[PDB]
RNA sequence: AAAUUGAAGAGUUUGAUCAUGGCUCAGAUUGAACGCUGGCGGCAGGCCUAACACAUGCAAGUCGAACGGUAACAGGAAGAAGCUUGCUUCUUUGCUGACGAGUGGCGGACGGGUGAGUAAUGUCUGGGAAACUGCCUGAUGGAGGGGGAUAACUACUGGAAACGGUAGCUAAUACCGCAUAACGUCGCAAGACCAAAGAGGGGGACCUUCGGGCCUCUUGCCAUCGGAUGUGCCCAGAUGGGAUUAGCUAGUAGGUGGGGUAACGGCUCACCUAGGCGACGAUCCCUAGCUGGUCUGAGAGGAUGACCAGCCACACUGGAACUGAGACACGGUCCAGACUCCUACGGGAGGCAGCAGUGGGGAAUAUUGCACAAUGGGCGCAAGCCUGAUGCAGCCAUGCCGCGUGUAUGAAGAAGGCCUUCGGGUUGUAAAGUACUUUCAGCGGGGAGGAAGGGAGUAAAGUUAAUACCUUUGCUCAUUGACGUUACCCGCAGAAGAAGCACCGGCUAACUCCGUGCCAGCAGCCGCGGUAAUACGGAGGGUGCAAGCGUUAAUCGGAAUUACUGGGCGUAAAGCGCACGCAGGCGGUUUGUUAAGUCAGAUGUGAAAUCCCCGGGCUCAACCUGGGAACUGCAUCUGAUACUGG
């Protein structure tokens, strides 16, 4: 139910950094970042219209750690919801607990944050939530529970976090290891070389 | 029958059947006497017979052997015809 | 007909084991099938014994079908070869009567009765 | 409260009965054209006052025969 | 006769009852005449959990409808609540 | 506030083209199966085939507060004794807590199963009038005085069994007279006529035949008029196909009268009239349970009727009625048929389309489980008893949803493999190493909720002669969970036990080498294979999915490819060889009228669930749930009169 294999392969295939490692290292010193995996990585894909749509959807999925079934269901919900579907898809992803745990800096990666969640190290409103896809709401307070507070992963995670751009819609107290999901992120909060409308196109045909 | 009470019910329903049959046969007899008088043209015999019949079609109604409406028609019908002749 | 029987705590744990024994028994079944056919090392029989008789057997008891078949292979000779096809655990069935329909054979049982669906097939075609 | 039908007399042969035809236009469920449909009713005509071709007003009542559950209310137009 | 009782809906281990007026012979979750309340035994009790149209319940009693042991309890409980 | 605010195209005829036209693909969906693989959980689903046949258990009982009663076990007792003098065992007696068998009452018409039959004594929508209706309910009165029986039992007797035969004998809320009898039935009226039953709980003077009287309350019984629920009946529209089926019909269509039903009715019979149905599809033939809804589609449609709910029909096959408020009875009766079982040979017995289970058929569909704790049904004043309804558990990846199978760091980037122009590229931060986490599975510890009630006491009110009893409502005490090792929480051990499947020529995301050589083989469509095959088969690499993945089957979509929305017929499939013409469709222009079509409004109905919208509850989700909106439909009334019809 989770992708467990090599991670930089995914970045290499999509042509971009997917933040699947902590960021302690320039990614180009860990892999040949600008070349696809495999014997024929140097080869260029003269890539069909379907192809660009597929790869964009894969990219987003691989960023958030979501497999097809759940992600399709995410599209369905984005569509049902009011307002722009493409933007609704990203709101839903960005509201996941494993994700939010990552953005408050409690985990070096979404993979690490997910493990924190699954392993009962995260509370929401002082209540233990251990499922990664838990949808987090405005004004919620997610926190590292007392016993998980001395984990060195978390301190390192918060350090790296302090060096990333700081997300607007979250208020994080690094000392308490608690943080507040102030509001749903706008579209403008999220990276601009994500092409949701391509993903929207892939799932309407 | 297979079930204990099913057996008992068949026994009771047979008893009731022979009870009802007996009273029902009696009743129709007393109804038939009236129609027979009518068909012979006698007011008195037919009125007399109607008077014997009345209390028993009424009673068998009260006793559930027949419904009230049946008792009534019989009285209505015979009364109609006997009057129409004398 | 006989074997070692062992009880287990849970059935789910014993499902894979039971299916495992089937795989081995099936693998050797196809193994013994390939050998006997390839053993002749020729496209046909070297002589005129090719004429054979087929039989279909279903016995009510499992102990007999393995035991009497061994005695049924004793009467076999070089001239006329007899072979058993589709030994049954009991009674008779549609696919059994169908088995005797494809290849002409006698349908016999140590002890058996005809099913309602079995009579219709046997009475219709000549058997 | 006087529910009623209007139609014309297609048969007056029977003793104290009549056959009345009620005709109406109906939108076709699939192809939209408006189609004529007819409903023939066995109706009671005590006194046989209804002539064939007459236009008559009828009402629904209890069963009067195996096929009659309607009786005459009054004649409207006659002998065209 | 006509009775007022609980038809058990909800899910396995999470009972949820629909209070209904019905001919007592019909199945518990089958044909009913009128729905008249509900009863959640698993309500958090932080908010609601038991709602009865007492006006229609009484109307039906007035016409001889009987009442479950469990509905007879709910009614005394709800009458106490307010 | 919101609540249908939604719609894609690709390959393939040709040397190439445009058109025509079929085939094929991308999508959703499934009660699925098979092949490979397979960790946990929540919720759902699970004989689609043979309405084939079924061993065994269980699935309908209950009331001693209707009745005679004791045979079991349980005490109790004058009196027998265990006697070691208060502990007792048996002989006895229903004395009573109870209770086998019996009469009696209520239930066996519900609940549960199936879809064979049925194109209509069906269903859906909407209306009618001639009716009955147990239990529950409001109203008003009865509940008087008698009689003959009978099961049980006793004696004698026949049977292998099933089950009988004689004569005794006895009870009742069993059964029948007699009285009483109207706001009941018949009748214009005068009049005439119809019923019943007791049983318990407690008790003050009072007293006897010590049974009770009598006092009191509960409950059942009878009558009549209502309510509520259920059911029967009637009309209209709609609800499959076929003309290689065009005529059909004697109870037939109607009328009169008698009979009949709970009730209208050719329901039935006699007589009379000669009708009734049919091209707006009768008759005949084929097929089929109908609906809410389900799947698909932007919609209009198309397909469909498991699981949930409503109606119908059936209960081995054909027929029949008896009992009853209700049945022509799913575990009742009778006859006939098919079939099976028992037998001491003479005779008997049964009907899983209830729940498990078996054989058979099949590509294929589960355990001969636990519990009445909860909801609900039957009986009972109750306690309670019964409940394969139901709640649960087992089995299966069948589906949906959730989670895991680790996280981070880790380079000249090892070995091995693979490609290479031998420079190197790749597998690949992948692995090893380094720290780090412990969900789930394992193991110990603790521990919600589903529980409302019911039981003893107590107190107050209504009762009443009464503080009894009864009933209601408060109080305390001790109690009731099949699931269950529950949900959930804490602790321990270690990355430890948890990854496979299909694909990579174009459509279509993913390319190379070796082997083969029109072979072996692939193939949804085009089309691959005779020496460079990205198409066969293996490998390395890659793509897509992931506890699944593929293949097959199946509906709709794309298919504007049955075209109502939404197409065509000169040469592509398609104008009858030509004309006349009935039915039918359509019909110039003016006025008046009508108001069926059409339009408007109002009212009722359109079950709930489902779908959709906004909320609420399970850690999330599936799932459960509140309210709304929607059900685009039907019907009645009242209007409007331009258009269509008269």
Short mmCIF file of N, CA and C in Angstrom, two decimals, chain C residues 9-115:
data_model
loop_
_atom_site.label_atom_id
_atom_site.label_comp_id
_atom_site.label_asym_id
_atom_site.label_seq_id
_atom_site.Cartn_x
_atom_site.Cartn_y
_atom_site.Cartn_z
N UNK C 9 -5.17 -26.09 15.39
CA UNK C 9 -5.87 -25.09 16.19
C UNK C 9 -6.82 -24.27 15.33
N UNK C 10 -6.31 -23.72 14.24
CA UNK C 10 -7.10 -22.88 13.35
C UNK C 10 -7.10 -23.44 11.93
N UNK C 11 -8.20 -23.23 11.21
CA UNK C 11 -8.34 -23.77 9.86
C UNK C 11 -7.58 -22.94 8.83
N UNK C 12 -7.49 -21.63 9.06
CA UNK C 12 -6.84 -20.72 8.13
C UNK C 12 -5.36 -21.06 7.96
N UNK C 13 -4.73 -21.46 9.05
CA UNK C 13 -3.32 -21.82 9.03
C UNK C 13 -3.11 -23.15 8.31
N UNK C 14 -4.16 -23.96 8.26
CA UNK C 14 -4.08 -25.29 7.68
C UNK C 14 -4.52 -25.31 6.22
N UNK C 15 -4.96 -24.17 5.71
CA UNK C 15 -5.43 -24.09 4.33
C UNK C 15 -4.26 -24.15 3.34
N UNK C 16 -3.22 -23.38 3.63
CA UNK C 16 -2.06 -23.31 2.76
C UNK C 16 -1.31 -24.65 2.72
N UNK C 17 -1.29 -25.34 3.85
CA UNK C 17 -0.62 -26.63 3.95
C UNK C 17 -1.33 -27.67 3.09
N UNK C 18 -2.65 -27.68 3.16
CA UNK C 18 -3.46 -28.63 2.40
C UNK C 18 -3.32 -28.39 0.91
N UNK C 19 -3.28 -27.12 0.51
CA UNK C 19 -3.13 -26.76 -0.89
C UNK C 19 -1.71 -27.07 -1.37
N UNK C 20 -0.76 -27.06 -0.44
CA UNK C 20 0.63 -27.36 -0.76
C UNK C 20 0.80 -28.82 -1.14
N UNK C 21 0.08 -29.70 -0.44
CA UNK C 21 0.15 -31.13 -0.71
C UNK C 21 -0.49 -31.46 -2.05
N UNK C 22 -1.47 -30.65 -2.45
CA UNK C 22 -2.13 -30.84 -3.74
C UNK C 22 -1.18 -30.51 -4.88
N UNK C 23 -0.40 -29.44 -4.70
CA UNK C 23 0.55 -29.01 -5.71
C UNK C 23 1.61 -30.05 -6.01
N UNK C 24 2.11 -30.70 -4.96
CA UNK C 24 3.11 -31.75 -5.12
C UNK C 24 2.50 -32.97 -5.79
N UNK C 25 1.29 -33.32 -5.38
CA UNK C 25 0.59 -34.48 -5.93
C UNK C 25 0.17 -34.20 -7.37
N UNK C 26 0.00 -32.93 -7.71
CA UNK C 26 -0.38 -32.57 -9.06
C UNK C 26 0.88 -32.51 -9.93
N UNK C 27 1.98 -32.04 -9.35
CA UNK C 27 3.24 -31.94 -10.08
C UNK C 27 3.77 -33.31 -10.48
N UNK C 28 3.60 -34.29 -9.60
CA UNK C 28 4.05 -35.65 -9.88
C UNK C 28 3.07 -36.33 -10.83
N UNK C 29 1.82 -35.87 -10.82
CA UNK C 29 0.80 -36.41 -11.71
C UNK C 29 1.12 -36.05 -13.15
N UNK C 30 1.51 -34.80 -13.38
CA UNK C 30 1.92 -34.36 -14.70
C UNK C 30 3.29 -34.91 -15.06
N UNK C 31 4.10 -35.18 -14.04
CA UNK C 31 5.43 -35.74 -14.24
C UNK C 31 5.32 -37.17 -14.76
N UNK C 32 4.50 -37.98 -14.10
CA UNK C 32 4.31 -39.37 -14.50
C UNK C 32 3.55 -39.46 -15.81
N UNK C 33 2.86 -38.38 -16.17
CA UNK C 33 2.10 -38.32 -17.42
C UNK C 33 3.04 -38.09 -18.60
N UNK C 34 4.04 -37.25 -18.40
CA UNK C 34 5.00 -36.92 -19.45
C UNK C 34 5.95 -38.09 -19.73
N UNK C 35 6.33 -38.80 -18.67
CA UNK C 35 7.26 -39.92 -18.80
C UNK C 35 6.67 -41.08 -19.59
N UNK C 36 5.47 -41.50 -19.20
CA UNK C 36 4.82 -42.65 -19.82
C UNK C 36 4.57 -42.44 -21.31
N UNK C 37 4.28 -41.21 -21.70
CA UNK C 37 4.03 -40.88 -23.10
C UNK C 37 5.32 -40.80 -23.90
N UNK C 38 6.37 -40.28 -23.26
CA UNK C 38 7.66 -40.09 -23.92
C UNK C 38 8.51 -41.36 -23.85
N UNK C 39 8.10 -42.30 -23.01
CA UNK C 39 8.88 -43.51 -22.76
C UNK C 39 9.04 -44.35 -24.03
N UNK C 40 8.01 -44.37 -24.87
CA UNK C 40 8.03 -45.17 -26.09
C UNK C 40 9.10 -44.67 -27.06
N UNK C 41 9.39 -43.37 -26.98
CA UNK C 41 10.38 -42.72 -27.84
C UNK C 41 10.07 -42.91 -29.32
N UNK C 42 8.78 -43.04 -29.64
CA UNK C 42 8.35 -43.18 -31.02
C UNK C 42 6.91 -42.69 -31.15
N UNK C 43 6.50 -42.31 -32.35
CA UNK C 43 5.20 -41.68 -32.57
C UNK C 43 4.03 -42.65 -32.45
N UNK C 44 4.33 -43.94 -32.37
CA UNK C 44 3.28 -44.96 -32.32
C UNK C 44 3.85 -46.23 -31.69
N UNK C 45 3.04 -47.28 -31.61
CA UNK C 45 3.50 -48.57 -31.11
C UNK C 45 4.20 -49.34 -32.22
N UNK C 46 5.27 -50.05 -31.85
CA UNK C 46 6.08 -50.78 -32.82
C UNK C 46 5.32 -51.95 -33.46
N UNK C 47 4.27 -52.41 -32.79
CA UNK C 47 3.48 -53.53 -33.29
C UNK C 47 1.98 -53.26 -33.18
N UNK C 48 1.18 -54.29 -33.45
CA UNK C 48 -0.26 -54.13 -33.60
C UNK C 48 -1.12 -54.25 -32.35
N UNK C 49 -0.54 -53.99 -31.18
CA UNK C 49 -1.29 -54.09 -29.93
C UNK C 49 -2.08 -52.82 -29.64
N UNK C 50 -2.04 -51.88 -30.58
CA UNK C 50 -2.65 -50.56 -30.43
C UNK C 50 -4.13 -50.63 -30.02
N UNK C 51 -4.80 -51.72 -30.38
CA UNK C 51 -6.20 -51.90 -30.00
C UNK C 51 -6.33 -52.12 -28.49
N UNK C 52 -7.17 -51.30 -27.86
CA UNK C 52 -7.31 -51.32 -26.41
C UNK C 52 -8.77 -51.16 -25.99
N UNK C 53 -9.04 -51.41 -24.71
CA UNK C 53 -10.37 -51.23 -24.15
C UNK C 53 -10.32 -50.24 -22.99
N UNK C 54 -11.31 -49.36 -22.93
CA UNK C 54 -11.39 -48.36 -21.87
C UNK C 54 -12.50 -48.71 -20.88
N UNK C 55 -12.29 -48.40 -19.61
CA UNK C 55 -13.30 -48.63 -18.59
C UNK C 55 -13.47 -47.40 -17.71
N UNK C 56 -14.66 -47.24 -17.15
CA UNK C 56 -14.95 -46.14 -16.24
C UNK C 56 -15.45 -46.71 -14.92
N UNK C 57 -14.80 -46.35 -13.83
CA UNK C 57 -15.11 -46.93 -12.53
C UNK C 57 -15.35 -45.88 -11.44
N UNK C 58 -16.48 -46.01 -10.76
CA UNK C 58 -16.73 -45.22 -9.55
C UNK C 58 -17.25 -46.14 -8.45
N UNK C 59 -16.48 -46.27 -7.37
CA UNK C 59 -16.87 -47.11 -6.25
C UNK C 59 -17.22 -46.26 -5.05
N UNK C 60 -18.24 -46.68 -4.30
CA UNK C 60 -18.72 -45.91 -3.16
C UNK C 60 -17.65 -45.69 -2.10
N UNK C 61 -16.75 -46.66 -1.95
CA UNK C 61 -15.70 -46.58 -0.94
C UNK C 61 -14.37 -46.20 -1.59
N UNK C 62 -13.58 -45.40 -0.88
CA UNK C 62 -12.30 -44.93 -1.38
C UNK C 62 -11.23 -46.01 -1.30
N UNK C 63 -11.40 -46.93 -0.36
CA UNK C 63 -10.43 -47.99 -0.15
C UNK C 63 -10.31 -48.96 -1.31
N UNK C 64 -11.42 -49.17 -2.02
CA UNK C 64 -11.46 -50.16 -3.10
C UNK C 64 -10.79 -49.67 -4.38
N UNK C 65 -11.10 -48.45 -4.79
CA UNK C 65 -10.68 -47.93 -6.10
C UNK C 65 -9.17 -48.01 -6.30
N UNK C 66 -8.40 -47.82 -5.23
CA UNK C 66 -6.96 -47.93 -5.32
C UNK C 66 -6.52 -49.39 -5.25
N UNK C 67 -7.24 -50.18 -4.45
CA UNK C 67 -6.85 -51.55 -4.18
C UNK C 67 -7.19 -52.51 -5.32
N UNK C 68 -8.41 -52.42 -5.84
CA UNK C 68 -8.85 -53.38 -6.85
C UNK C 68 -8.28 -53.02 -8.22
N UNK C 69 -7.95 -51.75 -8.41
CA UNK C 69 -7.35 -51.30 -9.66
C UNK C 69 -6.00 -51.98 -9.87
N UNK C 70 -5.26 -52.15 -8.77
CA UNK C 70 -3.99 -52.86 -8.81
C UNK C 70 -4.20 -54.29 -9.27
N UNK C 71 -5.30 -54.90 -8.83
CA UNK C 71 -5.66 -56.24 -9.25
C UNK C 71 -6.24 -56.21 -10.66
N UNK C 72 -6.74 -55.05 -11.05
CA UNK C 72 -7.32 -54.88 -12.37
C UNK C 72 -6.21 -54.66 -13.40
N UNK C 73 -5.04 -54.26 -12.93
CA UNK C 73 -3.88 -54.09 -13.80
C UNK C 73 -3.09 -55.39 -13.90
N UNK C 74 -3.45 -56.36 -13.08
CA UNK C 74 -2.80 -57.67 -13.10
C UNK C 74 -3.29 -58.50 -14.28
N UNK C 75 -4.56 -58.31 -14.63
CA UNK C 75 -5.17 -59.05 -15.73
C UNK C 75 -4.77 -58.46 -17.08
N UNK C 76 -4.09 -57.33 -17.05
CA UNK C 76 -3.63 -56.67 -18.27
C UNK C 76 -2.62 -57.54 -19.01
N UNK C 77 -2.67 -57.48 -20.34
CA UNK C 77 -1.75 -58.25 -21.17
C UNK C 77 -1.17 -57.39 -22.28
N UNK C 78 -0.13 -57.89 -22.94
CA UNK C 78 0.52 -57.16 -24.02
C UNK C 78 -0.42 -56.96 -25.21
N UNK C 79 -1.13 -58.02 -25.57
CA UNK C 79 -2.07 -57.99 -26.69
C UNK C 79 -3.13 -56.91 -26.51
N UNK C 80 -3.99 -57.08 -25.52
CA UNK C 80 -5.03 -56.11 -25.22
C UNK C 80 -4.70 -55.36 -23.94
N UNK C 81 -4.63 -54.03 -24.04
CA UNK C 81 -4.32 -53.21 -22.88
C UNK C 81 -5.58 -52.56 -22.32
N UNK C 82 -5.78 -52.69 -21.01
CA UNK C 82 -6.93 -52.08 -20.35
C UNK C 82 -6.45 -51.01 -19.37
N UNK C 83 -7.18 -49.91 -19.31
CA UNK C 83 -6.81 -48.80 -18.43
C UNK C 83 -8.03 -48.17 -17.78
N UNK C 84 -7.87 -47.73 -16.54
CA UNK C 84 -8.96 -47.09 -15.80
C UNK C 84 -8.92 -45.58 -16.04
N UNK C 85 -10.10 -44.98 -16.19
CA UNK C 85 -10.19 -43.55 -16.43
C UNK C 85 -11.18 -42.90 -15.46
N UNK C 86 -10.70 -41.95 -14.68
CA UNK C 86 -11.55 -41.19 -13.78
C UNK C 86 -12.18 -41.98 -12.65
N UNK C 87 -11.34 -42.62 -11.83
CA UNK C 87 -11.83 -43.35 -10.67
C UNK C 87 -12.54 -42.41 -9.70
N UNK C 88 -13.78 -42.75 -9.35
CA UNK C 88 -14.59 -41.90 -8.51
C UNK C 88 -14.61 -42.26 -7.04
N UNK C 89 -15.02 -41.31 -6.21
CA UNK C 89 -15.11 -41.52 -4.77
C UNK C 89 -16.41 -42.22 -4.40
N UNK C 90 -17.43 -42.04 -5.25
CA UNK C 90 -18.73 -42.64 -5.01
C UNK C 90 -19.79 -42.34 -6.05
N UNK C 91 -20.87 -43.11 -6.03
CA UNK C 91 -22.01 -42.91 -6.91
C UNK C 91 -21.74 -42.82 -8.40
N UNK C 92 -22.36 -41.81 -9.01
CA UNK C 92 -22.23 -41.52 -10.43
C UNK C 92 -22.57 -40.05 -10.64
N UNK C 93 -22.13 -39.48 -11.75
CA UNK C 93 -22.39 -38.07 -12.03
C UNK C 93 -22.44 -37.70 -13.51
N UNK C 94 -22.87 -36.47 -13.79
CA UNK C 94 -22.99 -36.00 -15.16
C UNK C 94 -21.67 -36.06 -15.91
N UNK C 95 -20.61 -35.56 -15.29
CA UNK C 95 -19.30 -35.50 -15.93
C UNK C 95 -18.69 -36.89 -16.07
N UNK C 96 -19.20 -37.84 -15.30
CA UNK C 96 -18.74 -39.22 -15.38
C UNK C 96 -19.37 -39.93 -16.58
N UNK C 97 -20.67 -39.70 -16.77
CA UNK C 97 -21.38 -40.27 -17.91
C UNK C 97 -20.89 -39.61 -19.19
N UNK C 98 -20.49 -38.35 -19.08
CA UNK C 98 -19.92 -37.62 -20.20
C UNK C 98 -18.54 -38.19 -20.53
N UNK C 99 -17.83 -38.62 -19.49
CA UNK C 99 -16.50 -39.20 -19.65
C UNK C 99 -16.57 -40.50 -20.44
N UNK C 100 -17.65 -41.24 -20.26
CA UNK C 100 -17.84 -42.50 -20.97
C UNK C 100 -18.48 -42.26 -22.34
N UNK C 101 -18.97 -41.05 -22.55
CA UNK C 101 -19.61 -40.69 -23.82
C UNK C 101 -18.56 -40.40 -24.89
N UNK C 102 -17.51 -39.68 -24.51
CA UNK C 102 -16.44 -39.32 -25.43
C UNK C 102 -15.73 -40.56 -25.96
N UNK C 103 -15.21 -41.37 -25.04
CA UNK C 103 -14.55 -42.62 -25.40
C UNK C 103 -15.41 -43.79 -24.97
N UNK C 104 -15.67 -44.72 -25.89
CA UNK C 104 -16.50 -45.88 -25.60
C UNK C 104 -15.91 -46.70 -24.47
N UNK C 105 -16.70 -46.91 -23.43
CA UNK C 105 -16.24 -47.62 -22.24
C UNK C 105 -17.41 -48.20 -21.46
N UNK C 106 -17.11 -49.17 -20.61
CA UNK C 106 -18.12 -49.72 -19.71
C UNK C 106 -18.10 -48.94 -18.41
N UNK C 107 -19.29 -48.58 -17.92
CA UNK C 107 -19.40 -47.83 -16.68
C UNK C 107 -19.82 -48.78 -15.57
N UNK C 108 -18.90 -49.03 -14.63
CA UNK C 108 -19.12 -50.03 -13.59
C UNK C 108 -18.85 -49.41 -12.23
N UNK C 109 -19.45 -49.98 -11.19
CA UNK C 109 -19.25 -49.52 -9.83
C UNK C 109 -19.32 -50.69 -8.88
N UNK C 110 -18.52 -50.66 -7.82
CA UNK C 110 -18.54 -51.73 -6.82
C UNK C 110 -19.92 -51.70 -6.18
N UNK C 111 -20.39 -50.49 -5.91
CA UNK C 111 -21.72 -50.24 -5.36
C UNK C 111 -22.16 -48.84 -5.74
N UNK C 112 -23.19 -48.74 -6.56
CA UNK C 112 -23.66 -47.42 -6.94
C UNK C 112 -25.11 -47.43 -7.39
N UNK C 113 -25.72 -46.26 -7.34
CA UNK C 113 -27.10 -46.08 -7.73
C UNK C 113 -27.10 -44.96 -8.74
N UNK C 114 -28.10 -44.95 -9.60
CA UNK C 114 -28.17 -43.93 -10.64
C UNK C 114 -28.88 -42.67 -10.16
N UNK C 115 -28.26 -41.52 -10.39
CA UNK C 115 -28.86 -40.24 -10.05
C UNK C 115 -29.97 -39.90 -11.04
#
